[PDB]
Amino acid sequence: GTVNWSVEDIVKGINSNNLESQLQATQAARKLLSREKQPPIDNIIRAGLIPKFVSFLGKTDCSPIQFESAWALTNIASGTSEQTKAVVDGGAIPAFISLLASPHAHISEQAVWALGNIAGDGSAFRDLVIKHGAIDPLLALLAVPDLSTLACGYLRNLTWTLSNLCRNKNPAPPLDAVEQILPTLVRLLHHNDPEVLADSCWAISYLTDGPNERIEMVVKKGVVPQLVKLLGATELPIVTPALRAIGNIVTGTDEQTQKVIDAGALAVFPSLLTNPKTNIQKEATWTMSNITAGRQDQIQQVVNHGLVPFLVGVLSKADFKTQKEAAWAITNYTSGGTVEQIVYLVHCGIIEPLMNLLSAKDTKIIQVILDAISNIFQAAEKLGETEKLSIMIEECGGLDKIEALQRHENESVYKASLNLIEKYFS
Ligand SMILES: NCCCC[C@H](NCc1cccc(-c2cccnc2)c1)C(N)=O
Numbered sequence: 001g002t003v004n005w006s007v008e009d010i011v012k013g014i015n016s017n018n019l020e021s022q023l024q025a026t027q028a029a030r031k032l033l034s035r036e037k038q039p040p041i042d043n044i045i046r047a048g049l050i051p052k053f054v055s056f057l058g059k060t061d062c063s064p065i066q067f068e069s070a071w072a073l074t075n076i077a078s079g080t081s082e083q084t085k086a087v088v089d090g091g092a093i094p095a096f097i098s099l100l101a102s103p104h105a106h107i108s109e110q111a112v113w114a115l116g117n118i119a120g121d122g123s124a125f126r127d128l129v130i131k132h133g134a135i136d137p138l139l140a141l142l143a144v145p146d147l148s149t150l151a152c153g154y155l156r157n158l159t160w161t162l163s164n165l166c167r168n169k170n171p172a173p174p175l176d177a178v179e180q181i182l183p184t185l186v187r188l189l190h191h192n193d194p195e196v197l198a199d200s201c202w203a204i205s206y207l208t209d210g211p212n213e214r215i216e217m218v219v220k221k222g223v224v225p226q227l228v229k230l231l232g233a234t235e236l237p238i239v240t241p242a243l244r245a246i247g248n249i250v251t252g253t254d255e256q257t258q259k260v261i262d263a264g265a266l267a268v269f270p271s272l273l274t275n276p277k278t279n280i281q282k283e284a285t286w287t288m289s290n291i292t293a294g295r296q297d298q299i300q301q302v303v304n305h306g307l308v309p310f311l312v313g314v315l316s317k318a319d320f321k322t323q324k325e326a327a328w329a330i331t332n333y334t335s336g337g338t339v340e341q342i343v344y345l346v347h348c349g350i351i352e353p354l355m356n357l358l359s360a361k362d363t364k365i366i367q368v369i370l371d372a373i374s375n376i377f378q379a380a381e382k383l384g385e386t387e388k389l390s391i392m393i394e395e396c397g398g399l400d401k402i403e404a405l406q407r408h409e410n411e412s413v414y415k416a417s418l419n420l421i422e423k424y425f426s
């Protein structure tokens with residue numbers, strides 16, 4: 001009946017003076033916009049159908065045409081930014097918000113999905129969805145004693161849309177909106193469905209992707225222990241945002257970082273730092289680099305949990321971007337650490353992999369490593385053992401790499417190189 005209509009016929013039906021003809025044509029449009037291979041979204045838009053779809057959203061008396069038009073519109077709004085804008089410009093946002101409280105679950109759910117795609121397009125549309133009042137009725141759909149009584153797909157949909165209201169930057173979402181959403185987020189974060197957990201984790205990672213005040217309003221809700229638990233999950237779609245969130249949180253204050261350690265995060269890092277997924281290992285090392293930039297007592301906890309050999313491991317062998325993060329973790333450790341902590345680092349074998357990376361055609365990691373070497377000598381000076389350190393560096397071929405850096409493009413590299421040589425190598 002409604003399979004593979006032409007746009008011309010859809011237009012004829014929607015323009016008819018007959019609600020049933022309009023319904024049948026709207027369903028035809030929905031199916032056309034749903035096809036996997038290149039759905040003719042721009043042709044539907046050019047045909048002027050968006051405002052007609054939007055007017056159908058208001059037909060309380062005909063719930064099937066509300067549903068079909070909602071679905072058609074959602075198909076369009078899930079496209080490019082220009083296509084999402086066409087839907088918003090047709091007046092769809094308040095129409096969809098009014099549909100959240102529909103008695104028909106299928107329709108409500110379609111409106112949830114539409115608003116998530118609109119909000120997800122960017123900061124301005126996100127904020128516009130919020131200004132039209134979407135948050136209260138969305139939260140109201142989750143106001144049941146036990147989330148398990150809700151249909152799984154319905155709950156995943158709501159969680160995903162809430163995560164889009166948390167998502168973008170410049171600006172970040174309104175503080176007021178974040179505080180309104182966060183308690184429901186915390187509740188979703190302990191719900192036993194992997195997709196809900198993943199999307200809740202993503203939402204938390206967005207909210208913590210900012211200044212310390214933003215991190216604080218999340219941490220104050222007490223979610224860090226649950227994040228650390230999820231960090232240990234077997235499902236990669238859960239571990240990835242949980243680690244992103246934890247990583248964001250330790251870019252904050254010493255106290256915020258301490259909550260992460262206190263919750264037992266460091267015990268997961270032997271696995272994370274050797275994870276077969278490259279981006280997990282990269283993000284875990286980044287996280288370590290922010291922890292070693294903390295207090296000496298926090299560095300000591302990294303030591304105590306046996307993580308220094310793992311950092312030596314990543315420095316020794318890893319995707320290059322991961323090795324760069326490891327170099328940062330080592331520079332931060334040596335800038336901030338006690339003499340005894342720095343000695344321990346050398347006893348763990350940091351020198352050879354550090355020196356091997358001076359071969360890297362990448363100016364930034366080089367300065368970073370030279371910085372680390374300078375820091376280690378400084379600790380050695382306080383023990384009167386630069387000579388022993390110099391021999392070490394000399395034996396693994398480090399002197400040759402530093403001397404080769406004499407004749408190198410960069411001024412910081414040059415200067416730092418020659419300084420090290422004349423100061424510690426005859
Ligand atoms: N002074 C501005 C800040 C300088 C320090 C720092 N550079 C951050 C930075 C640089 C390069 C890479 C990352 C990174 C990589 C992988 C995962 N996660 C992150 C992070 C930052 N916090 O922006």
Ligand SMILES: NCCCC[C@H](NCc1cccc(-c2cccnc2)c1)C(N)=O
Pocket residue numbers: 286289290293325328332335336
């Ligand atoms: N005062 C504490 C916060 C700043 C710490 C300070 N700045 C550098 C710093 C701290 C933490 C992480 C990074 C970093 C840079 C690039 C890539 N990945 C990670 C850099 C330092 N040298 O310890």
